[PDB]
Design a binder for this molecule. Structure first.
Ligand SMILES: NC[C@@H]1O[C@H](O[C@H]2[C@@H](O)[C@H](O[C@@H]3[C@@H](O)[C@H](N)C[C@H](N)[C@H]3O[C@H]3O[C@H](CO)[C@@H](O)[C@H](O)[C@H]3N)O[C@@H]2CO)[C@H](N)[C@@H](O)[C@@H]1O
Ligand SMILES: [Mg+2]
Ligand SMILES: [Mg+2]
Ligand SMILES: [Mg+2]
Ligand SMILES: [Mg+2]
Ligand SMILES: [Mg+2]
Ligand SMILES: [Mg+2]
Ligand SMILES: [Mg+2]
Ligand SMILES: [Mg+2]
Ligand SMILES: [Mg+2]
Ligand SMILES: [Mg+2]
Ligand SMILES: [Mg+2]
Ligand SMILES: [Mg+2]
Ligand SMILES: [Mg+2]
Ligand SMILES: [Mg+2]
Ligand SMILES: [Mg+2]
Ligand SMILES: [Mg+2]
Ligand SMILES: [Mg+2]
Ligand SMILES: [Mg+2]
Ligand SMILES: [Mg+2]
Ligand SMILES: [Mg+2]
Ligand SMILES: [Mg+2]
Ligand SMILES: [Mg+2]
Ligand SMILES: [Mg+2]
Ligand SMILES: [Mg+2]
Ligand SMILES: [Mg+2]
Ligand SMILES: [Mg+2]
Ligand SMILES: [Mg+2]
Ligand SMILES: [Mg+2]
Ligand SMILES: [Mg+2]
Ligand SMILES: [Mg+2]
Ligand SMILES: [Mg+2]
Ligand SMILES: [Mg+2]
Ligand SMILES: [Mg+2]
Ligand SMILES: [Mg+2]
Ligand SMILES: [Mg+2]
Ligand SMILES: [Mg+2]
Ligand SMILES: [Mg+2]
Ligand SMILES: [Mg+2]
Ligand SMILES: [Mg+2]
Ligand SMILES: [Mg+2]
Ligand SMILES: [Mg+2]
Ligand SMILES: [Mg+2]
Ligand SMILES: [Mg+2]
Ligand SMILES: [Mg+2]
Ligand SMILES: [Mg+2]
Ligand SMILES: [Mg+2]
Ligand SMILES: [Mg+2]
Ligand SMILES: [Mg+2]
Ligand SMILES: [Mg+2]
Ligand SMILES: [Mg+2]
Ligand SMILES: [Mg+2]
Ligand SMILES: [Mg+2]
Ligand SMILES: [Mg+2]
Ligand SMILES: [Mg+2]
Ligand SMILES: [Mg+2]
Ligand SMILES: [Mg+2]
Ligand SMILES: [Mg+2]
Lengths: 125, 138
RNA sequence: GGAGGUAAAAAUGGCAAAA
RNA sequence: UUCCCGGGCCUUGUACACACCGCCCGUCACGCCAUGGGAGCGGGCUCUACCCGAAGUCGCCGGGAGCCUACGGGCAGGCGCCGAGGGUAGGGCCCGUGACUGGGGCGAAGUCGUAACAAGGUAGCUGUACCGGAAGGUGCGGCUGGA
RNA sequence: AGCUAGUUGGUGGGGUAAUGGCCCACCAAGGCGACGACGGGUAGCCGGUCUGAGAGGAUGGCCGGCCACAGGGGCACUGAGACACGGGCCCCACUCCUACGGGAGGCAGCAGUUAGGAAUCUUCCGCAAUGGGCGCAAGCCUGACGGAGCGACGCCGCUUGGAGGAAGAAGCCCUUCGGGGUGUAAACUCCUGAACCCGGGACGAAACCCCCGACGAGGGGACUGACGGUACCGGGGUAAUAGCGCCGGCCAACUCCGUGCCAGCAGCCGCGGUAAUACGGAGGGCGCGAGCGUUACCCGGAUUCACUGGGCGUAAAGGGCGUGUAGGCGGCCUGGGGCGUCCCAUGUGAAAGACCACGGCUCAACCGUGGGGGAGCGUGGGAUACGCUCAGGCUAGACGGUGGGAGAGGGUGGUGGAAUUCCCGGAGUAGCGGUGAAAUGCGCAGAUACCGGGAGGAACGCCGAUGGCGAAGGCAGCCACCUGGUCCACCCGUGACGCUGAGGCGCGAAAGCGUGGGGAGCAAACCGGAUUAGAUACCCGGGUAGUCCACGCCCUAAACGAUGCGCGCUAGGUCUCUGGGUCUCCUGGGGGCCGAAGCUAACGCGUUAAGCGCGCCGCCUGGGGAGUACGGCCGCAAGGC
């Protein structure tokens, strides 16, 4: 455009949108479980991913993904929200941390224990 | 209507260098004649003279080129590779002595109009004046 | 010899996939 | 050698390229989500007009009536304007909610048809108008993104 | 998109330390706004901080400067100073004590609680330092401060040994079993010595005070340390925690087993459905280390908001076209000013931070000193090339004059023929139309085909073209009137009058709407007859609005050259339309094809640019949802912006 149009209209900034509405963008958010179930994936895959709708402290109600192998989630379990979405799951844009709440960590996990909240085992090794 | 007689003149030269014409007639004004004086000092042209066309004064500028290269596309190397007006009338550009560009790391020339006449980047840095940066040539 | 210039027919093919 | 089946060369068109046994459009059925309309209901902020209006500054009175150390003075006190705030009534914005409803997005293989892409078997697209379960069809005019 | 009652100005008062509608009476009717008032949302602002090559983008946590609040709101008193955090009065909310009538309180001070939350500490020591209030002083107060404690929260420093050591133990992993890998790694042998035990032990402290000198200068003397017996110094002395992420590509590091689109991984592309270096485990390896990852946010990459530094023929994007307001921009010459602009000096730009040197903690982090400049803004002085302004002048831009030239340019009125349909007369028969083929339909009530006459509407064959005209949509028989635009010659007059153009304004095919007129042909809808599985379609026979006129609306488009307007510049060849000439040929405008240089991603453009430049406007920023919904304006409605 011309120089004179730049002092009239000006340049517009992008002003991006948060993919995570976690109330001021807090890193974590406590919530209580209400349902614990499985949801079929998108068209290029097929499995049964374990999910849970959670009623956080902000008054909303969203779906979260349960990672790992095996868990302990019921209709009345407290849990912590991580953040990050699942590509094959529609409407699921949050993750569940494991280890310190009524949601335990993946037991019999040996490689990545920081994620999936498994504590250090000592079996003479 | 000639919104910019200076930038038009710079393109009357650019339309001639790409076809290797002997000369080009541009309209006359003393400010653009003063630009041709600096253009002959650094050696981009062979000169100019005040000619008369249809009773009106024009400036017949004698262009300068390189030697005929060997191999395909025997067009000689341009003496003037790039030339364009900086201080356009829609966007005036005024600079001091500290804000003078290193045109082609000094291999080029930055012509500018100052209070002590129209000079180039070297002598304007020596005199220490600065002003309206007209054009860059390299 | 440069233009204007000839239709009776007949639908469909599960999703996803190699250096 | 006009026609059916297969094949070779040249060319044209193409949205096809596990390549027409290709692709792809729309309605309907199911599930989830967000959003608009909606008899209305609720909430927050704000504006206007009036009624009441505490403290207090300021302005009169200080008298049939008080206290005061100098008194054609002071203090208490009475009144008046303004006034936080409360109320009554009507509006302006925003938000939540509501039976029901309109279209939309998403969801590996459900139904109905063949619209487009090969002259897609009615050249296609288009602005408008009318009709039809639906892609769509047709009328008038226009475009080459077709001969 | 309009706002304004103390709203804007005046006069006189009130009030203040002080100007002021700050407040009050009277008068005038003004003030603000696309340069974005008014309203809505959000937010303390800065030095600086983070990023970035830079320009910029983001941010305002610690420290420092300014403002504003002390549960919410108002108000004054005191006083140099307050509308006052630990002062006063009153209302609301809340807590507590009551003998019930009326009282007490205000952590956003230091700690500590509760509640919220992903999450943030000690109800510690001391006035020894520095600083503050009071006091002549002695001295008192100081949760300011100096310190200590909690927390890998961040940066920095250090440890978990070091040197030897097998042709290379055991375990474990892979194996084409011959071997290869962990791996000098361990064990083992020397040496050093974190932690710990013992002794010593501070700097921060010198003044205020006292003595001589006059309680002055000057000199001398004494007292005091929370941190803390802590740092540190000397002697002795122990082999003394390693963990986290990754290993398909981006991206550095591969083999085995398990599982079989299950379980599962995932930031993007994507892996898994029987032999997976992408899942799970094991071995090995790579990266980093008291840390390693993850999630959330900011900048980068992103030249995907492009001033540096982008684009619009076909990828998203040129407004449908024109006229024109504000605005932006402006030809050649010469003077006056010096506003932009440039230079020199001066002042300011606090300090800290940042940059560079030298130092202090045994190094660094941290800290001390010193130096160097910013940008901006105020003042004085100078320069005048360019922009700006004033004045004189010019003609190449633009406009006019004289005389011609073409054209379906527009509006109004009149008119000509051919053809279709219908009516009438004649003559004339058994079929005509229709299709790919048939049927519906018309026809012995006399059809088709032929002749003659009449009515009525619409469109103008041949000329006619790859043609012309207009700004666009668009415009075609003929005549005349009214009228616009344009081209050439002469170079006569004016003399910079110029280009673009937000808003506004006018035009705007077809379809549609209103009122009236008209209706031959055609023809949405609709009804038949065929086709087909079905036909709401293609094909056929009928057929109403509409198509046509006058006036008023609607304002869309593949409104297309999918290319905005004006000007200057860069080889030509060739077809045609239309002026002028010393009409061979030259020269001016208009429509086309091919093509130099050049541009583009290619197709392609190429003096009718998509080339090289300048001025201005519109517009684009992944696809869908969607030109949808709400709000606003327009419209009779359909609907449009
Ligand atoms: N996706 C954009 C829109 O999709 C619409 O189409 C939507 C539906 O009409 C369409 O439905 C199709 C149906 O056409 C077709 N005949 C059968 C097919 N299984 C359906 O598919 C749908 O439904 C199945 C489950 O029933 C889902 O698992 C699947 O993801 C979904 N595509 O699937 C689409 C949703 O994915 C229209 N085409 C139009 O509005 C537009 O294209
Ligand atoms: Mg240099
Ligand atoms: Mg079917
Ligand atoms: Mg698949
Ligand atoms: Mg052959
Ligand atoms: Mg072929
Ligand atoms: Mg097919
Ligand atoms: Mg008296
Ligand atoms: Mg008296
Ligand atoms: Mg509602
Ligand atoms: Mg609602
Ligand atoms: Mg709904
Ligand atoms: Mg399914
Ligand atoms: Mg079709
Ligand atoms: Mg078809
Ligand atoms: Mg078709
Ligand atoms: Mg149509
Ligand atoms: Mg129809
Ligand atoms: Mg705030
Ligand atoms: Mg950058
Ligand atoms: Mg409080
Ligand atoms: Mg207090
Ligand atoms: Mg808590
Ligand atoms: Mg002290
Ligand atoms: Mg003191
Ligand atoms: Mg071994
Ligand atoms: Mg000491
Ligand atoms: Mg020692
Ligand atoms: Mg690698
Ligand atoms: Mg396997
Ligand atoms: Mg592997
Ligand atoms: Mg693995
Ligand atoms: Mg991986
Ligand atoms: Mg950027
Ligand atoms: Mg970024
Ligand atoms: Mg730019
Ligand atoms: Mg771009
Ligand atoms: Mg397209
Ligand atoms: Mg496009
Ligand atoms: Mg256009
Ligand atoms: Mg357009
Ligand atoms: Mg000028
Ligand atoms: Mg000046
Ligand atoms: Mg400073
Ligand atoms: Mg003049
Ligand atoms: Mg003349
Ligand atoms: Mg104009
Ligand atoms: Mg119209
Ligand atoms: Mg019409
Ligand atoms: Mg009508
Ligand atoms: Mg008909
Ligand atoms: Mg059929
Ligand atoms: Mg018909
Ligand atoms: Mg066109
Ligand atoms: Mg020409
Ligand atoms: Mg060409
Ligand atoms: Mg324009
Ligand atoms: Mg529309």
């Amino acid at each position: 455009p011309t120089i004179n149009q730049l002092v009239r209209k000006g340049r517009e900034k992008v002003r991006k949108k948060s993919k995570v509405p976690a109330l001021k963008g807090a890193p974590f958010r406590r919530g209580v479980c209400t349902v614990v179930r499985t949801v079929t994936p998108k068209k290029p895959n097929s499995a049964l991913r374990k999910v849970a709708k959670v009623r956080l402290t902000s008054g909303y109600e969203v779906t979260a993904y349960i990672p790992g192998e095996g868990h302990n989630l019921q209709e009345h379990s407290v849990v912590l929200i991580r953040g990050g979405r699942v590509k094959d799951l529609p409407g699921v844009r949050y993750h569940i941390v494991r280890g310190v709440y009524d949601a335990a960590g993946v037991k019999d996990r040996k490689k990545s224990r920081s994620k999936y909240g498994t504590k250090k085992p000592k079996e003479a090794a | 209507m000639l919104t910019d007689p200076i930038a038009d003149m710079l393109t009357r030269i650019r339309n001639a260098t790409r076809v290797y014409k002997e000369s080009t007639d541009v309209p006359a004004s003393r400010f653009k004649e003063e630009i041709l004086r600096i253009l002959a000092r650094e050696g981009f042209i062979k000169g100019y003279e005040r000619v008369d066309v249809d009773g009106k004064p024009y400036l017949r500028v004698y262009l300068k080129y390189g030697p005929r290269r060997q191999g395909p596309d025997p067009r000689p190397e341009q003496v003037i590779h790039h030339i364009r007006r900086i201080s356009k009338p829609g966007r005036r550009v005024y600079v001091g002595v500290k804000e003078i560009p290193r045109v082609r790391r000094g291999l080029g020339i930055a012509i500018l109009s100052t209070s002590k006449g129209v000079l180039t980047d070297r002598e304007a840095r020596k005199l220490g004046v600065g002003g309206e940066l007209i054009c860059e040539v390299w």
